[PDB]
Write an enzyme that holds these catalytic residues in place. Structure first.
Site, short mmCIF file in Angstrom:
data_model
loop_
_atom_site.label_atom_id
_atom_site.label_comp_id
_atom_site.label_asym_id
_atom_site.label_seq_id
_atom_site.Cartn_x
_atom_site.Cartn_y
_atom_site.Cartn_z
N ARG A 69 0.85 -1.18 0.00
CA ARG A 69 0.00 0.00 0.00
C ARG A 69 0.88 1.24 0.00
NH1 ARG A 69 -4.48 -1.33 4.74
NH2 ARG A 69 -6.07 -2.32 3.41
N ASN A 81 6.67 -3.82 6.07
CA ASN A 81 6.46 -5.26 6.02
C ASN A 81 6.57 -5.91 4.64
OD1 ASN A 81 6.31 -5.77 8.71
ND2 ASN A 81 4.13 -6.30 8.76
N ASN A 140 6.76 -10.60 7.20
CA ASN A 140 5.50 -9.88 7.17
C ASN A 140 4.59 -10.37 8.30
OD1 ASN A 140 3.18 -8.41 6.41
ND2 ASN A 140 2.51 -10.05 5.02
N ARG A 157 4.67 -4.09 14.33
CA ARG A 157 4.47 -2.72 14.79
C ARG A 157 4.41 -2.62 16.31
NH1 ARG A 157 -1.84 -1.68 12.98
NH2 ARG A 157 -2.76 -3.42 14.16
N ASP A 201 -4.25 2.58 5.81
CA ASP A 201 -5.35 2.81 4.89
C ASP A 201 -6.36 3.76 5.53
OD1 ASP A 201 -6.55 1.22 6.84
OD2 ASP A 201 -7.57 -0.08 5.39
N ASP A 206 -3.95 -9.21 17.18
CA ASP A 206 -2.95 -8.50 17.96
C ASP A 206 -3.64 -7.41 18.79
OD1 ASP A 206 -3.42 -7.57 15.26
OD2 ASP A 206 -2.00 -5.95 15.69
N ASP A 207 -4.65 -6.75 18.22
CA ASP A 207 -5.35 -5.71 18.96
C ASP A 207 -6.18 -6.30 20.11
OD1 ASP A 207 -7.81 -5.04 16.28
OD2 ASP A 207 -6.98 -6.90 17.12
C1 LIG Z 1 -9.31 -0.63 12.15
C2 LIG Z 1 -9.06 -2.13 12.05
O1 LIG Z 1 -10.02 -2.92 12.20
N1 LIG Z 1 -7.80 -2.52 11.79
C3 LIG Z 1 -7.29 -3.86 12.11
C4 LIG Z 1 -7.83 -4.89 11.09
O2 LIG Z 1 -7.67 -4.39 9.75
P1 LIG Z 1 -8.07 -5.08 8.34
O3 LIG Z 1 -8.51 -6.48 8.61
O4 LIG Z 1 -8.92 -4.07 7.70
O5 LIG Z 1 -6.70 -5.14 7.56
P2 LIG Z 1 -5.70 -4.12 6.90
O6 LIG Z 1 -5.52 -4.60 5.53
O7 LIG Z 1 -6.31 -2.77 7.05
O8 LIG Z 1 -4.33 -4.28 7.71
C5 LIG Z 1 -4.12 -3.62 8.95
C6 LIG Z 1 -2.66 -3.21 9.10
O9 LIG Z 1 -1.82 -4.41 9.07
C7 LIG Z 1 -0.88 -4.31 7.98
N2 LIG Z 1 -0.75 -5.60 7.25
C8 LIG Z 1 -1.88 -6.22 6.65
C9 LIG Z 1 -1.81 -7.39 5.99
C10 LIG Z 1 -0.54 -8.06 5.88
O10 LIG Z 1 -0.38 -9.12 5.29
N3 LIG Z 1 0.56 -7.41 6.49
C11 LIG Z 1 0.53 -6.19 7.19
O11 LIG Z 1 1.53 -5.70 7.70
C12 LIG Z 1 -1.43 -3.23 7.03
O12 LIG Z 1 -0.44 -2.57 6.27
C13 LIG Z 1 -2.21 -2.30 7.95
O13 LIG Z 1 -1.42 -1.23 8.51
O14 LIG Z 1 -7.30 -6.24 11.35
C14 LIG Z 1 -5.83 -6.33 11.42
C15 LIG Z 1 -5.45 -7.78 11.69
O15 LIG Z 1 -5.29 -8.51 10.48
C16 LIG Z 1 -5.26 -5.33 12.48
O16 LIG Z 1 -5.72 -5.69 13.79
C17 LIG Z 1 -5.74 -3.90 12.11
O17 LIG Z 1 -5.24 -2.97 13.06
MN LIG Z 2 -8.13 -1.84 6.83
#
Ligand SMILES: CC(=O)N[C@H]1[C@@H](OP(=O)(O)OP(=O)(O)OC[C@H]2O[C@@H](n3ccc(=O)[nH]c3=O)[C@H](O)[C@@H]2O)O[C@H](CO)[C@H](O)[C@@H]1O
Ligand SMILES: [Mn+2]
Ligand SMILES: CC(=O)N[C@H]1[C@@H](OP(=O)(O)OP(=O)(O)OC[C@H]2O[C@@H](n3ccc(=O)[nH]c3=O)[C@H](O)[C@@H]2O)O[C@H](CO)[C@H](O)[C@@H]1O
Ligand SMILES: [Mn+2]
EC number: 2.4.1.223
Lengths: 253, 255
Positions: free
Chosen positions: A14, A39, A68, A73, A91, A183-184
């Site tokens: 991204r 990552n 990755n 973080r 994002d 993780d959160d």
């Molecule tokens: C607001 C919210 O609900 N965000 C959470 C959710 O986002 P989402 O499931 O929406 O995923 P996402 O694609 O927004 O990724 C969250 C963060 O993790 C990073 N990323 C993602 C995929 C990967 O293979 N490697 C990597 O480093 C990415 O760049 C971003 O900063 O679920 C994730 C777990 O998967 C994390 O808990 C995110 O904090």
């Molecule tokens: Mn997201």
């Protein structure tokens, strides 16, 4: 470094968004420094391009990662000099007004996760929990709803929780890598266990925008696994929703 | 019990009918332990007989006749108050049970602060001189939004220990309140913030609060802020822009 926060943004495939968000976040008040958790294993970072477009208000530190992993973080980066960390997914664009206000709230509750995304756990079968949001029935209490978690992907929390996170049982770390998720949830478990208070406080955002299936299933799974590992459900419910008095104008009436 | 409960202290004057209607409402609010009616109608017989004739009631209502019609009578330490929390409401205001149940839950988490529905502030345009006002006055705060430095006691929750602490305040304070027959709420806010080192109150936005109701009133309040600043040798009031609402009440108010 005092009365300032550090932005930790983990990025993966991204880069275009990352650079656009960085252009926004670099100008936020009280921002001390930015740490990009790169990552994208084996991919050149955009630091050259970034510097070529300098000067910038604060130092932006790109830290290449060996793998990755979602947890990258959450490491204790030596470069972090502030007591507070602002963690935002690569994002999400949160207005400076939301950040300045939320940071001021964090300073008054430095031991809790101050954020814009509230979620909860519910239970309909003794000892079995489910992860969800406002689409699920309120857990217990009276009217209104409740949240028991504030997602770290859009929050302010004490940098000392990064260290405390590393000190959690191996079963917790094992679980995170296993799902590359949760993780959160783990962070929220950890915080409330440390404070005895709701892990976080929900601040309603005025201007937060997202720029763009076993995920939710893993979420419930993790809550149950964590309850087993910690041998108990520590999350505490809260229905406190904080807004800024007078912002927007006359929002108090 | 009395621990997870609060006591309503309602001072009344020339609003007996209004008082009675309000009483019908407040008596049914959850977590209400008792009601203390500070009767400021010197020389007139209380409606206690009428009240009991219409019983039974959910909680004991204590009518306490006062020797004089003073604003600070409701700030006395009534022996009948058995709760750590006091709910103070003017006899012209109807606060919904939902607001009260929620605000009380907030108070339980910030027991040393005044949790209320009416936020106000002090401002200064001239070094050392203060003025009283609301959102119609410029923000004294740093940036955007507004700020409040007081939560009026006339519709709030606060620690009963503060009633005792108020009795211990400098005579000049009691004098000032008796002089203007105003500013008791401002005096209370000064007291609390000086005691805690934190903003005296926390504003909880009401969902359903209705009023069923001298120009010197406002002018007096500004006067009191300065008079109080002299008595205490300083302006202790601290600003805050925290506005608390109930998550999910109304439904989806988080979006
Ligand atoms: C607001 C919210 O609900 N965000 C959470 C959710 O986002 P989402 O499931 O929406 O995923 P996402 O694609 O927004 O990724 C969250 C963060 O993790 C990073 N990323 C993602 C995929 C990967 O293979 N490697 C990597 O480093 C990415 O760049 C971003 O900063 O679920 C994730 C777990 O998967 C994390 O808990 C995110 O904090
Ligand atoms: Mn997201
Ligand atoms: C919401 C709000 O801003 N409320 C305050 C404001 O109300 P107001 O200025 O609106 O005055 P009000 O007429 O509502 O009186 C407030 C309270 O004081 C009582 N009362 C009034 C007149 C009298 O001679 N004797 C008596 O006991 C009355 O019964 C009521 O419970 O100013 C008052 C001081 O004057 C008190 O600080 C009130 O808490
Ligand atoms: Mn009135």
């Amino acid at each position: 470094a005092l009365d300032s926060f550090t932005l930790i943004m983990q990025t993966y495939n991204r880069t275009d968004l990352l650079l656009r968000l960085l252009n926004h976040y670099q100008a936020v008040p009280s921002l001390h420094k930015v740490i990009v958790v790169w990552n994208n294993v084996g991919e050149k970072g955009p630091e050259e391009l970034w510097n070529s477009l300098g000067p910038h208000p604060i130092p932006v530190i790109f830290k290449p990662q060996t793998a990755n992993k979602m947890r990258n973080r959450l490491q204790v980066f030596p470069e972090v000099e502030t007591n507070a960390v602002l963690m935002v997914d690569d994002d999400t664009l949160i207005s400076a007004q939301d950040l300045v206000f939320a940071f001021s709230i964090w300073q008054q509750f430095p031991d809790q996760i101050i954020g814009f995304v509230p979620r909860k756990h519910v239970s309909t079968s003794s000892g079995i929990y489910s992860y969800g949001g406002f689409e699920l029935q309120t857990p217990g209490p009276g009217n209104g709803d409740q949240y028991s978690m504030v997602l770290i992907g859009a929050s302010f929390f004490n940098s000392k929780y990064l260290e405390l996170f590393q000190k959690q049982p191996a079963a917790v770390h094992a679980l995170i890598d296993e799902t590359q998720n949760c993780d959160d949830i783990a962070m929220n478990f950890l915080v409330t266990r440390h404070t005895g208070k709701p892990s976080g406080i929900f601040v309603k955002p005025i201007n937060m925008v997202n720029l763009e299936a076993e995920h939710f299933l893993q979420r419930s799974y993790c809550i149950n696994k964590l309850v087993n590992i910690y041998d108990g459900m520590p999350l505490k419910y809260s229905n406190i929703m904080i807004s800024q008095f007078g912002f927007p104008y006359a929002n108090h009436k």
